[PDB]
Design a protein around this ligand. Sequence first.
Ligand SMILES: Nc1nc2c(ncn2[C@@H]2O[C@H](COP(=O)(O)OP(=O)(O)OP(=O)(O)O)[C@@H](O)[C@H]2O)c(=O)[nH]1
Ligand SMILES: Nc1nc2c(ncn2[C@@H]2O[C@H](COP(=O)(O)OP(=O)(O)OP(=O)(O)O)[C@@H](O)[C@H]2O)c(=O)[nH]1
Ligand SMILES: [Mg+2]
Ligand SMILES: [Mg+2]
Lengths: 168, 168
Amino acid sequence: YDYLFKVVLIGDVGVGKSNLLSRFTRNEFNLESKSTIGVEFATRSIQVDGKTIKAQIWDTAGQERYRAITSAYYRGAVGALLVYDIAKHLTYENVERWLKELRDHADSNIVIMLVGNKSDLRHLRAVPTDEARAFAEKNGLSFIETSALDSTNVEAAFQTILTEIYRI
Amino acid sequence: YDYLFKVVLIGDVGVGKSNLLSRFTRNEFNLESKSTIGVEFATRSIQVDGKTIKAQIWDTAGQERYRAITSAYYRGAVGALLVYDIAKHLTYENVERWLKELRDHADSNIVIMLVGNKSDLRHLRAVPTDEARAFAEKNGLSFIETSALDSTNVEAAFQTILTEIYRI
Ligand SMILES: Nc1nc2c(ncn2[C@@H]2O[C@H](COP(=O)(O)OP(=O)(O)OP(=O)(O)O)[C@@H](O)[C@H]2O)c(=O)[nH]1
Ligand SMILES: Nc1nc2c(ncn2[C@@H]2O[C@H](COP(=O)(O)OP(=O)(O)OP(=O)(O)O)[C@@H](O)[C@H]2O)c(=O)[nH]1
Ligand SMILES: [Mg+2]
Ligand SMILES: [Mg+2]
């Protein structure tokens, strides 16, 4: 590989972060996935503007009651995938909080993509694409909508963040 | 015992149903409890107006995407404990949906108690007591606020519903 990019997934419990990870790195999916214990990462190589980037993608539970995610999680991260659930409006609402946590724990220069995941659930939508696109644009984040379930826009979400990072 | 009363817990995922149950029947609590798989029930005997009621309390996951709770869950129930989380407004919002579900699957004569649980969590309240006390009142349900963590109002919640049922 030519460069290593550490990227982190963050977003509320249940929005689909670990299945974004597994979709991207092993092309596997799991409808019966339990809340994530401790921290995981997995790697995959791709091609970005001619180069081989090894993407190191980190993942962990969205739950922070008694046990908070520390700076060590975010340490060295060039990209954050900030995921919410298009069908549950509270998860979009908590984006603020994740931005706050990014400001708090991550580099001032982290590239942040807002990802509205679970697009297959077209009919259950509680968050309109153009509202979120406009929230992204107003906060200076990239934006995409994915489905880890039917595998739509996943490799794109990743390739885009990784390209942005490479071109900074 | 002099009577058997089947009571069901219902309410969104995570509002604290299985710990209401475990608190009530074995005085045990589990901060690390995972989402309930299949159906469970457990019993405890108490005194209601001079009589020995055996309370049979049923529980199951609040999740219904691919697998819906059927009428057999509800069959024979004289009381429902309709639980939400005082710290998550969306669980209160879905009460409408649980009432709908009571109307579809349970007896027209079921006694329903609205329980706002996780009341220790005072400082993170997203649902005002009196708004809920008045939603109960407008819908002909009883109302109580509980904490399965600090034992507050748990035995009382059960004891009041069983008393309501015994007196219909
Ligand atoms: N419909 C649909 N469901 C999905 C999709 N991706 C994930 N899910 C489901 O959402 C549920 C939770 O997703 P997971 O990937 O664990 O959620 P996650 O953010 O790790 O959650 P935590 O580990 O608790 O922080 C699982 O049942 C997934 O199958 C998707 O693309 N479409
Ligand atoms: N602070 C606080 N947390 C509670 C209380 N009761 C339950 N919890 C926590 O909420 C989380 C989930 O509660 P459980 O009782 O499984 O929720 P439940 O409705 O069975 O949820 P499902 O089985 O998924 O439908 C656990 O971490 C519990 O410890 C409470 O009274 N106070
Ligand atoms: Mg996870
Ligand atoms: Mg349960």
